[PDB]
Design a protein around this ligand. Sequence first.
Ligand code: HEC
Ligand code: HEC
Ligand code: HEC
Ligand code: HEC
Ligand code: HEC
Ligand code: HEC
Ligand code: HEC
Ligand code: HEC
Ligand code: HEC
Ligand code: HEC
Ligand SMILES: [Ca+2]
Ligand SMILES: [Ca+2]
Ligand SMILES: [Ca+2]
Ligand SMILES: [Ca+2]
Ligand SMILES: [Ca+2]
Length: 626
Amino acid sequence: SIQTLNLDITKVSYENGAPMVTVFATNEADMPVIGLANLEIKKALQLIPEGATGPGNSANWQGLGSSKSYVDNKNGSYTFKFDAFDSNKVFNAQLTQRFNVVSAAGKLADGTTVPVAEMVEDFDGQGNAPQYTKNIVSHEVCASCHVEGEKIYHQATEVETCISCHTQEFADGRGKPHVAFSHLIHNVHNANKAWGKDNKIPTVAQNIVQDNCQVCHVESDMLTEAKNWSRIPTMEVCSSCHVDIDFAAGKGHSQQLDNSNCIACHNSDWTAELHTAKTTATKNLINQYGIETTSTINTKTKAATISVQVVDANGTAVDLKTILPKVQRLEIITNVGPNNATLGYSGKDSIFAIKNGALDPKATINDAGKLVYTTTKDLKLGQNGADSDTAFSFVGWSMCSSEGKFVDCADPAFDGVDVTKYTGMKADLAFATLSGKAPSTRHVDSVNMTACANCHTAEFEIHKGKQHAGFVMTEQLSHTQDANGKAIVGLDACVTCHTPDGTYSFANRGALELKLHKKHVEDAYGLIGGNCASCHSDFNLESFKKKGALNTAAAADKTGLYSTPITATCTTCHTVGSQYMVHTKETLESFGAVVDGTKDDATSAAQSETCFYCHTPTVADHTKVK
Ligand code: HEC
Ligand code: HEC
Ligand code: HEC
Ligand code: HEC
Ligand code: HEC
Ligand code: HEC
Ligand code: HEC
Ligand code: HEC
Ligand code: HEC
Ligand code: HEC
Ligand SMILES: [Ca+2]
Ligand SMILES: [Ca+2]
Ligand SMILES: [Ca+2]
Ligand SMILES: [Ca+2]
Ligand SMILES: [Ca+2]
């Protein structure tokens, strides 16, 4: 029943010596929550100030104990006492006092379900507001990539709880400097050294975080120590990624025996700039130029002509001739039937209209300075229902770049493997109809690029390398808004290649309905698990009525096997015959499904599935049945 448990420390009194701490618990409606059985002060701490343990040294949380002893006051308030407060006799009323309060997920007596809740609050030594803090990050940055409300590795769900246990005192006591949170946190996302008894190399963490300080260190008016990432250089933290320096021995660096002089040479401006220089320069390059793309069908030849207008940062026309020698690639992929693409991967129209400053002979720049390209593949417009009246064209492009500048592509044969030599630019999408009626467009209301950008950043150059320019997904290809009038950046353009017939092979589950699920259930399950909300605002179950067969397997002879579309969509994570699927192939067929059959059988059965008679999936609970 309870969706969110709010916790406030409303009162701290030292009038009896050891503090009495009152917590007030409210639900999402701000109603008092009575009967909490698993409330605890997980840690009582006080803040040793910046520099007190030595010149250049970090502020530290000194341990004062913990408590599970509390009275339920029957009004939403709970009052803690400490049986053994400050066992080390270090309590100092001149220091900031911190309390880390946790409520374990569980159930009240009446059976009301209660979610986990965690918080910290800081005070002075009399229970008033604090005079100074160590507020550098907030839990929210972790939720960008780790499912909110789930434990991150172990122990807790919020970074402040991690910080309250993984203290300098904790690390010193175990003779393990590396388990201090300010070392650990960088260590577990950086592949320069392994961590844990089993020496995990953080290959995946490294691939996502890419040492980008700004995914966790965010400037914030609520966090007065947010600039500590550049302002407090110490061998203890800087060594977490810089693993080959021995400061003591002067190996990899001049000898340093303490943190006294780090800041004298490692000025905040330099530390901040050097660690963010390349992502900032790339983002600046991406935002220099745009494209505006149109498509028309010649009603007699039934070929689409795509026109690309380059524009500058202010939406002002740039003649493509003026920048052609710096255009590394421009690719146009055209498919048909945006709700159920009809040409497959092999049948799609595709061209590198530009490669390393050279126009393909099939592409021209007109006197208006636009690129013009006409499809050559049969688009089969109108040959598969009303949806097949619409051709949709995905434009991806890249410009040659070195050290934050656009450069001439000096090498015609440059293969696009070295991604330091070019920038993927903003991709576009253009619709055209044979009939001259308004085009169909695919739904974009269930998943969008904002979800992707949480883990991959808004500057994600998708497929950048030898095969592709790299697609940057922006409002350039938005054709609808959400309830609040924000432009939706959909992945509808991706269907040009991620077709119901799959991609280059019938074996890859290349259909967009399957591919993102396949990739992320295999490689991102530690981050996502069953958390559909990581990509989905909702499920568009109505879209299934516009789908046909979906490619789900390759037969022995390399030909395509297909499933009815709901079965195909669910089976990506619930493989038939595996421990992840209770329904046998026979049972799925009894519910109207075709499972890895012919395209004709799957197509004929595509609207015969009874799955949604029983299954009532929501993003909150996709497992829900009658
Ligand atoms: C929109 C819903 C998303 C798109 C489009 C993509 N993702 Fe992800 N993703 C994540 C991890 C941890 C990996 C594996 C990294 C690794 O193995 O090193 C991936 C992988 C991809 C890939 C493959 C190419 C690449 O690694 O860059 C593509 C093309 C891709 N993803 C596109 C993490 C996340 C994540 C965090 C919880 C979210 C919300 C998404 N990905 C969503 C999308
Ligand atoms: C996306 C840009 C991330 C942000 C922001 C944070 N983390 Fe992360 N983390 C991320 C990835 C891709 C990985 C590798 C996961 C894997 O499956 O290998 C991790 C790893 C961790 C770990 C290690 C335990 C493990 O999952 O292997 C911990 C303890 C961890 N992350 C914690 C963490 C905290 C506390 C964050 C907020 C400060 C945080 N992460 C941000 C991706 C991202
Ligand atoms: C105490 C109440 C803890 C809280 C809260 C968190 N962690 Fe922890 N962690 C704790 C101990 C006692 C240990 C073992 C230390 C040792 O002697 O080896 C750990 C270990 C980790 C590790 C492994 C680190 C390494 O081996 O280098 C990770 C990655 C880790 N802890 C992460 C972590 C995160 C993200 C937390 C907040 C959600 C967190 N821990 C809280 C004790 C405590
Ligand atoms: C999330 C995965 C992070 C990324 C990426 C980086 N940092 Fe970080 N940093 C993070 C946390 C959760 C903490 C602990 C905050 C606390 O309250 O204890 C830190 C701490 C630092 C510090 C220490 C500051 C101090 O007062 O001693 C420094 C100097 C620091 N981080 C630097 C840093 C740099 C240079 C990064 C990019 C290369 C960077 N961090 C990434 C979480 C994350
Ligand atoms: C991992 C998250 C890191 C932490 C924590 C710190 N640094 Fe770093 N540093 C990191 C990378 C990936 C790079 C290369 C950046 C690039 O694009 O070139 C760096 C680079 C430096 C440099 C540049 C010169 C050199 O020889 O590397 C300096 C002077 C440097 N880093 C200093 C530094 C200090 C003082 C840190 C603690 C505050 C620090 N780094 C943390 C990755 C990470
Ligand atoms: C001036 C006399 C310095 C003092 C004192 C410290 N460092 Fe340093 N450091 C300095 C220079 C000129 C360089 C090379 C810069 C470059 O761009 O090449 C460095 C390098 C580092 C690095 C990065 C090493 C690498 O990437 O290979 C780190 C992490 C670093 N320094 C940290 C650091 C700390 C923590 C210090 C106090 C203990 C410290 N340095 C002192 C110049 C000076
Ligand atoms: C044709 C020019 C393509 C366009 C446009 C897009 N993708 Fe793609 N993708 C393509 C191929 C040939 C492959 C390999 C075969 C396969 O089916 O896996 C892929 C692969 C992916 C993957 C899997 C992981 C990877 O190999 O990178 C994902 C998650 C993926 N593609 C996503 C994707 C998105 C979101 C697109 C629109 C921005 C997109 N692709 C366009 C071919 C083509
Ligand atoms: C990001 C990595 C994703 C996660 C995590 C989940 N889904 Fe997804 N889903 C994703 C994409 C890119 C698409 C394709 C949209 C398109 O235009 O075809 C989908 C599609 C679905 C569908 C089809 C209906 C629709 O809304 O388009 C269903 C029924 C669906 N997804 C279910 C689903 C469930 C149950 C998940 C949690 C276990 C889940 N998805 C996670 C991307 C991602
Ligand atoms: C991967 C992105 C998934 C897609 C697509 C779908 N499901 Fe799923 N489901 C997934 C996971 C990781 C889990 C948890 C498994 C575990 O035990 O941890 C589930 C679970 C279900 C369940 C409950 C388990 C059971 O035995 O019944 C149901 C009923 C379920 N899933 C249904 C379902 C349907 C109908 C889907 C298509 C609309 C579907 N799932 C897609 C991961 C993914
Ligand atoms: C009612 C008679 C059902 C019809 C029709 C279909 N399914 Fe089902 N499904 C049903 C139940 C009662 C369960 C188990 C629920 C639980 O939580 O244990 C399921 C389970 C699934 C799952 C999860 C499988 C697993 O994790 O082992 C999936 C992916 C699933 N069902 C898909 C599905 C499809 C695609 C259907 C149409 C062909 C379909 N189900 C019909 C009940 C019923
Ligand atoms: Ca308070
Ligand atoms: Ca909280
Ligand atoms: Ca590491
Ligand atoms: Ca456009
Ligand atoms: Ca029907």
